Amino acid sequence: RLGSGGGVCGSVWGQNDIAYRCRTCENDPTCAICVPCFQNGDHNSHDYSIIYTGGGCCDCGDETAWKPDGFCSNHK
Amino acid sequence: RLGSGGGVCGSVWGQNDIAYRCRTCENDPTCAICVPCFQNGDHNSHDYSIIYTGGGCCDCGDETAWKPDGFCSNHK
Ligand SMILES: [Zn+2]
Ligand SMILES: [Zn+2]
Numbered sequence A, B: 001r002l003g004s005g006g007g008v009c010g011s012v013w014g015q016n017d018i019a020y021r022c023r024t025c026e027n028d029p030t031c032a033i034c035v036p037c038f039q040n041g042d043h044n045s046h047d048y049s050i051i052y053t054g055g056g057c058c059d060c061g062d063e064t065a066w067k068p069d070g071f072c073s074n075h076k
């Protein structure tokens, strides 16, 4: 998808991987971030969930997919 | 974003790149495909447009972003 450039997390998911959904930081229901990005950010009382994904990429740092307050440390 | 795996086009866009939007094959307004995927597929009377993108990735082959009839040859 289009999205922003700059300091976004490359990470890509293969067929038996884990990501995190966060209904609080997300722009739409298919946004997700990789495990390190979630744990290196602050989501304490957000409505997050674990997801076993078979594909996609981490939305961390891309403000067209993820609220910037939900970025982890290494992505602004 | 989440999306599908398998035979999807990796391609990623940097800060002065070209992609194609196709309002006909797209699932939502931010979907886009890279130049080779567009030209190796069939979009003759679709409502496509050129876009100078600064970021994102090609949606070709990912049926959660792009109608499969709009895939190019090398992605099913
Ligand atoms: Zn990440
Ligand atoms: Zn991150």
Ligand SMILES: [Zn+2]
Pocket (backbone or CB within 6 Å): A022, A024, A025, A042, A043, A046, A047, A048, A070
């Ligand atoms: Zn969150």
Ligand SMILES: [Zn+2]
Pocket (backbone or CB within 6 Å): B009, B010, B011, B033, B034, B035, B036, B037, B058, B059, B060
């Ligand atoms: Zn492509």
Ligand SMILES: [Zn+2]
Pocket (backbone or CB within 6 Å): B009, B036, B037, B060, B061, B071, B072, B073, B074, B075
């Ligand atoms: Zn393609």
Ligand SMILES: [Zn+2]
Pocket (backbone or CB within 6 Å): B022, B024, B025, B042, B043, B046, B047, B048, B070
């Ligand atoms: Zn098309």
